[PDB]
Each structure stands twice: as structure tokens, then as C-alpha cells.
Amino acid sequence: HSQDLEVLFQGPHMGHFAVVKLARHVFTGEKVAVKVIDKTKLDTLATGHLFQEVRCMKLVQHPNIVRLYEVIDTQTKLYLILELGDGGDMFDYIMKHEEGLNEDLAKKYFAQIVHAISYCHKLHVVHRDLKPENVVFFEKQGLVKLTDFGFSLAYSAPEILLGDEYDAPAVDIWSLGVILFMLVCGQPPFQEANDSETLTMIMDCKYTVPSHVSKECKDLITRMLQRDPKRRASLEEIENHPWLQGVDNIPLVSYKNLSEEEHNSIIQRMVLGDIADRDAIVEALETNRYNHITATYFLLAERILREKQEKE
Amino acid sequence: SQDLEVLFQGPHMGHFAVVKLARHVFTGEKVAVKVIDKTKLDTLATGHLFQEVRCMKLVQHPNIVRLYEVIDTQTKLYLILELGDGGDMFDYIMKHEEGLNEDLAKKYFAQIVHAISYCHKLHVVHRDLKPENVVFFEKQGLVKLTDFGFSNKFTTSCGSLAYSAPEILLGDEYDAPAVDIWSLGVILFMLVCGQPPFQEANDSETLTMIMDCKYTVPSHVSKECKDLITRMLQRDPKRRASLEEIENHPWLQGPSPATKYNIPLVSYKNLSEEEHNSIIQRMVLGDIADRDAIVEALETNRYNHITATYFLLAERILREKQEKE
Numbered sequence: 001h002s003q004d005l006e007v008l009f010q011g012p013h014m015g016h017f018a019v020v021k022l023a024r025h026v027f028t029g030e031k032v033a034v035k036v037i038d039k040t041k042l043d044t045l046a047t048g049h050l051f052q053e054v055r056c057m058k059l060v061q062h063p064n065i066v067r068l069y070e071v072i073d074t075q076t077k078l079y080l081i082l083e084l085g086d087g088g089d090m091f092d093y094i095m096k097h098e099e100g101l102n103e104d105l106a107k108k109y110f111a112q113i114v115h116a117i118s119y120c121h122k123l124h125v126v127h128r129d130l131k132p133e134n135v136v137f138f139e140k141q142g143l144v145k146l147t148d149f150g151f152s153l154a155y156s157a158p159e160i161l162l163g164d165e166y167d168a169p170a171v172d173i174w175s176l177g178v179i180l181f182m183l184v185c186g187q188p189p190f191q192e193a194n195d196s197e198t199l200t201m202i203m204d205c206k207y208t209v210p211s212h213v214s215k216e217c218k219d220l221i222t223r224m225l226q227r228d229p230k231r232r233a234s235l236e237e238i239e240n241h242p243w244l245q246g247v248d249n250i251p252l253v254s255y256k257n258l259s260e261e262e263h264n265s266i267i268q269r270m271v272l273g274d275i276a277d278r279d280a281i282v283e284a285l286e287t288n289r290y291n292h293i294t295a296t297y298f299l300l301a302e303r304i305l306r307e308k309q310e311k312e
Numbered sequence: 313s314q315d316l317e318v319l320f321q322g323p324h325m326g327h328f329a330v331v332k333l334a335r336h337v338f339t340g341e342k343v344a345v346k347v348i349d350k351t352k353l354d355t356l357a358t359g360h361l362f363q364e365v366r367c368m369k370l371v372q373h374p375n376i377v378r379l380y381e382v383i384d385t386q387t388k389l390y391l392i393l394e395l396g397d398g399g400d401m402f403d404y405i406m407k408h409e410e411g412l413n414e415d416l417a418k419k420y421f422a423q424i425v426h427a428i429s430y431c432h433k434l435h436v437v438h439r440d441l442k443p444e445n446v447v448f449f450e451k452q453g454l455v456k457l458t459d460f461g462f463s464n465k466f467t468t469s470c471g472s473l474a475y476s477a478p479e480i481l482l483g484d485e486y487d488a489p490a491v492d493i494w495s496l497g498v499i500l501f502m503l504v505c506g507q508p509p510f511q512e513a514n515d516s517e518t519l520t521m522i523m524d525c526k527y528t529v530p531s532h533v534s535k536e537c538k539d540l541i542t543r544m545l546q547r548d549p550k551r552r553a554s555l556e557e558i559e560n561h562p563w564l565q566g567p568s569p570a571t572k573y574n575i576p577l578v579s580y581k582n583l584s585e586e587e588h589n590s591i592i593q594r595m596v597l598g599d600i601a602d603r604d605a606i607v608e609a610l611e612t613n614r615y616n617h618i619t620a621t622y623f624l625l626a627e628r629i630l631r632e633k634q635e636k637e
Contacts, residue, residue: 004315004316004383004385004390005316005319007381007383007392008330008345008381008383008390008392009330011380011381011392012380013343013380013381013392014341016332016333016336017330017331017332017333018329018330018331018333018338019319019320019328019329019330019331020328020329020331021325021327021328022327022328022329022344023327024399024402024403025327025396025398025399025447025448026399027329030325032322032324032325033333069322069323069324070318070322070324072315072318072319079315079319081318081319081322081324085336087337088335088336088337089335089336091335092335133335136336137336
């Protein structure tokens with residue numbers, strides 16, 4: 001009765017699926033993905049934080065971010081109906097290029113990645129698990145898109161390995177730097193035999209850039225992969241870096257403000273939606289945290305300004 | 313209540329594939345879902361279809377699409393089915409503007425008739441046999457039958473006119489098996505000519521050609537195949553050929569020995585009085601039909617979800633008893 005997705009997706013005739021409409025028994029292009037998350041392997045404190053984190057995602061809308069169409073809750077499991085790509089992930093593509101992509105082609109992929117996270121960070125959305133495996137091809141459209149937002153050692157910023165309190169936007173900037181490296185060398189920037197030996201390198205932040213990599217692009221990598229989260233680069237620097245120039249709007253939250261009746265409506269709709277206790281919402285917004293509340297606030301803020309500009 | 317409704321009928325989008333992905337690319341682990349609309353259906357249609365679809369779950373044959381699950385809801389009915397890679401047969405035949413080579417027709421046709429042979433012995437008729445309902449599992453070498461004509465339909469009349477028997481165009485009572493036979497003859501004809509045997513500009517004159525049963529076979533088709541076709545395409549259903557004859561026509565024989573595998577025991581093993589009664593009692597308890605209903609259907613020798621559910625439950629009893637042997 002209430003385990004119908006369960007018998008479809010987990011039954012004996014067989015967690016990421018494609019649902020594709022058939023025509024005379026062959027695939028068409030009407031398709032969505034479905035991701036199945038195992039609630040059981042998680043606590044009710046953690047399972048409560050997962051559902052708020054993914055509900056928030058339905059509000060993200062960007063060409064280079066994979067849309068979350070629905071979340072369907074179950075006792076035992078959670079189902080995400082997602083946009084479905086065409087040519088696999090960006091990690092297998094790099095495996096097909098053992099010494100790197102040509103820089104002009106790299107630029108085209110990385111600009112899209114950076115444009116995506118740059119949009120996220122202006123809306124207080126933050127990926128936390130940024131890997132080439134989470135960059136996905138939409139080949140028929142000529143796009144890459146980020147998927148599988150957060151909530152394995154190479155991609156982790158070295159502060160994450162220390163366990164100390166993090167500034168979440170800077171960890172994405174690091175994970176951005178590991179991605180640039182892998183595009184232009186076809187190898188991860190920190191890889192030794194022992195998982196332990198590796199860890200030292202990442203803490204040290206000692207990597208070699210191959211000689212064929214241009215002077216500009218070498219500089220961009222050192223601006224994102226520095227041992228200290230405070231010295232890394234904000235996105236306006238990366239977005240406008242020389243290396244990315246030439247490669248061809250921006251979120252309204254960045255340069256316009258809410259009216260006070262507009263601001264109050266959001267916080268009212270947020271509490272009525274059981275997003276959080278109003279006190280927590282204002283601590284969050286004032287602390288300027290990077291979590292599903294601020295994100296919810298700022299995505300909803302953007303939908304009102306977008307409507308206000310349309311009327312004009 | 314509506315979780316499936318949102319998956320398949322949601323804004324992001326009835327026959328779908330559900331396919332396992334691995335690093336965001338398709339695999340071969342896949343099933344299919346056919347969605348059936350129960351609205352615009354009375355209560356007795358909705359009741360039977362639920363048992364027909366329910367009894368198709370018991371059919372097992374290499375040449376029939378497996379019906380793994382049924383999932384009933386208020387509006388829609390969801391059939392979890394076996395998914396092919398290959399397309400259907402009509403698109404295959406259409407690619408062959410002058411028919412398939414006769415020894416390839418033979419390979420496909422022999423498979424189709426083993427499917428219909430297994431069905432008719434277990435008192436299952438297709439009622440909608442046409443090359444669109446023959447699917448390719450070309451990774452496994454074979455074709456399987458699908459979309460059995462269930463109570464939703466009883467493909468529309470403008471389209472299915474070509475494939476329809478004269479007696480179901482005239483509209484009177486009929487032997488349902490003989491209708492599948494007529495449909496076998498039309499398929500064989502398409503396999504070896506890439507054209508349907510009755511087709512005209514007006515769909516009113518096609519109707520006449522079917523009633524009079526006039527068609528012409530290209531010269532290159534052998535005399536035996538030609539003969540098989542005329543034994544399945546008679547206007548009188550009493551004149552057509554039962555599956556023993558068809559399945560043993562020289563065109564498909566050629567004298568190798570026959571495998572007992574994939575043949576229903578119900579056709580040669582007999583049942584005891586206590587077992588016969590044990591089925592009907594399980595059927596009455598399972599609320600499939602009145603005991604009168606069941607005894608009447610078996611006495612009249614009908615082909616529907618009662619007699620079929622009877623010979624399927626029977627075959628299980630025969631298969632387990634044979635296992636003990």
C-alpha cells in the first residue's frame with residue numbers, strides 16, 4: 001500500500017534509476033532519473049536534517065545544476081525525481097584522458113562548474129561534496145551540470161580532515177581547485193600509495209603542475225588550492241580570472257534588497273511551512289550561516305524579486 | 313496513494329522503462345511498467361481485468377513477456393513487465409519491404425506458435441495477436457508475446473482492422489482460440505511478404521477483402537508455406553487448423569525429437585478428483601468466481617480468467633507432483 005515505490009524499485013525483479021517513456025518498445029527522450037536514499041542507515045536526528053536539506057533543493061533553478069523535481073518520503077526510504085543526463089559523469093571522461101584535457105576544452109567545462117557554484121554561493125547554497133563524479137553530462141544540450149549535493153580523501157579540503165570548524169564556501173573553492181587540476185592533468189593532485197602518505201601531502205598542500213600547463217591557469221590553481229581556507233579565492237576573482245576570459249543573469253539577491261513587507265512575508269511563509277522555529281531562522285540569517293534555512297530564505301527571496309522585475 | 317502517479321504522470325514527463333544506472337549510464341538491469349487507466353471502466357470490467365492481469369502473473373514461458381507484479385490503485389493499474397532490447401516485430405517486418413527470408417520467418421514463427429501453444433493448452437487466448445505485440449529480446453535470441461487483450465479493451469478499430477478476424481468484424485459469438493489462429497496466419501503472411509494480406513486506400517474495401525478472404529502470395533514463397541497460410545486464413549473458424557496441425561506442419565518440422573521442456577503437463581498428465589476439487593475450493597476461497605461459475609465455465613470449456621486460473625493452478629499441482637517423482 002505505502003511501499004509501492006518499494007516494490008517497483010526494490011522488488012525481486014532487480015540506488016539510481018532512469019525512468020524512460022517507451023514508444024513501440026524503444027526508448028524516447030522523455031526521461032527522468034530517480035534516486036533512492038536509505039533512511040534506515042541514519043538516525044532520526046540525521047534523517048530529519050536530510051529531508052530539510054533536500055526539500056530546500058527543489059527551489060534551486062539553474063541551467064548548470066540538476067533539477068530536483070520531487071521528493072517522495074517513505075517510512076524506510078526517500079525518493080528524488082531528478083533531471084537525467086546523457087553522457088555519464090566528468091570523472092569517467094577524465095579517465096579517458098590520462099594526461100589531461102586540452103586547456104581550451106577544459107575552460108568550457110570549468111566555466112560552467114564555476115558559474116554553477118558561483119550561483120549557489122550567492123544564494124547560501126553550498127555543495128560540500130564537489131567531485132568530478134558529481135559533474136554530469138547533458139551532451140545533446142552541450143552542458144555539464146552539478147548533481148548530488150552533499151547531505152573520497154583526494155577531494156577533501158585539508159581543514160575537513162582536521163575536523164575543525166569550516167567556512168563552507170571555502171571548501172567548495174578547494175574542491176573547485178582539485179577539479180581544475182584533474183581537468184588539465186587527468187590525474188588527482190594528491191595520490192600516493194598509502195591513504196596515510198596521501199593525507200600528509202594534502203595537509204602540506206604540496207602538488208606539482210605539469211610543464212605544459214599555461215602560466216595563467218597555473219596561477220588559478222594555486223589561488224584555490226592553498227592550505228589555509230582564508231587565503232583561497234572568492235568567486236568574483238575566479239569568475240573573472242584571465243584564464244576564463246573570452247568564454248561566453250546574475251542572482252538578484254546579490255545587488256537588490258527586499259522590502260520589509262516582502263522580508264516579513266518570507267519569514268512568515270517559512271515558519272508556516274515547518275522549515276524551522278522563527279527564532280532559529282533569525283539566528284541563522286544573522287549569523288549568516290550556510291544551511292537549508294538561509295538557503296530557503298534566499299531562494300524564496302529571489303523568486304519575489306524575479307517576479308517584481310518581470311512586472312517592470 | 314499517488315506516489316506512482318507522481319513518478320509517471322508528474323510534470324517532468326503509458327509504457328515506461330525503469331533502468332538501473334551506473335555512474336549515470338544505463339545498464340542491462342531493467343524492467344518495464346505499463347500503466348492502465350481504470351477510469352472509464354465499470355465495476356465488473358475493473359473486477360475481471362484485476363483477475364486477468366492477476367492470472368497472467370502465473371504464466372511462465374520463454375516466448376511470453378513475464379508479468380512480475382501488479383499494483384492496483386484508484387485510477388491507474390501498474391503492470392511491472394519484462395523489458396526487451398530490440399523493438400517490436402512490426403517495425404522489423406516494415407524494414408523488409410519484400411518480406412523476411414523464409415528461413416528467418418520460420419525461426420520467428422515457430423517461436424510465436426510455441427507461445428500460443430502453451431497459452432491455448434492452459435486455456436489462455438491472446439485476443440489481440442499482431443506483430444506490434446511480438447517484442448525482441450535480441451540479447452537472448454528470441455521474440456516474446458506481450459499486451460494480452462485484457463478486460464480494459466473488451467489497437468482501436470481504424471488501426472486493428474487489418475489484423476482482425478472476419479468473425480470479430482461480423483460481431484457474433486466465436487471460439488476465441490480460432491481467432492488467435494487467424495491472427496497467426498496474418499503474421500506469417502507479413503513475415504514473408506512485408507505487406508499485410510488485406511490493405512486498400514479505403515478502410516471499407518479492406519473490410520470486404522477480409523470477409524471474402526481473397527489475397528495473393530508472391531511467387532517466390534514455397535508451396536508448403538503457402539499451404540500453412542491458407543490453413544490459418546479461412547473465413548470459417550471451424551475450417552481453420554488447431555495448433556497440433558500448425559505446430560506439426562512440414563514447414564516448421566522440416567524429423568528431430570521433441571523436448572518435453574516448456575510444455576504444459578495439463579495436456580498429458582491427468583488430475584485426481586480430490587485435486588480438481590482442491591483447486592475449485594481455493595478458487596472459491598480466493599473469490600475468483602462462484603463455484604457454479606467455475607463448474608459452468610469448465611463444463612462449457614471457456615477461455616477466460618476462470619478456466620485459465622483453473623488450468624494454471626492445476627499445472628502447479630502437476631509440476632510439484634512431478635518434482636516428487
